[PDB]
């Protein structure tokens with residue numbers, strides 16, 4: 857159950873996810889997973905980033921779920937579960953702003 861994962865924040869808004877992540881103590885890749893505000897059946901992975909251009913900022917990626925039972929951000933790289941998707945992105949940045957590092961405090 858995705859609801860038992862400490863990185864799953866359930867039904868919080870995008871603005872609230874930004875408030876939690878825009879903390880100067882958060883290193884790049886600090887993240888959380890929440891329900892999408894407008895897309896029924898999709899989740900959003902919210903991730904903190906940092907560069908000298910923008911400083912501290914937050915990106916949101918849509919995690920799609922297939923009825924066949926697969927989870928993915930890009931259809932070319934799918935996973936059997938949200939847990940496996942999170943594990944994969946903690947090691948590969950691929951197209952994300954940064955690899956996932958720490959669960960949002």
Ligand SMILES: O=P(O)(O)Oc1cccc2c1NCCC2
Nearest residue numbers: 870891892893894895900916918
């Ligand atoms: O849940 P939100 O606020 O991040 O709003 C969205 C609704 C649906 C999809 C997405 C949202 N924000 C941009 C990225 C994808």
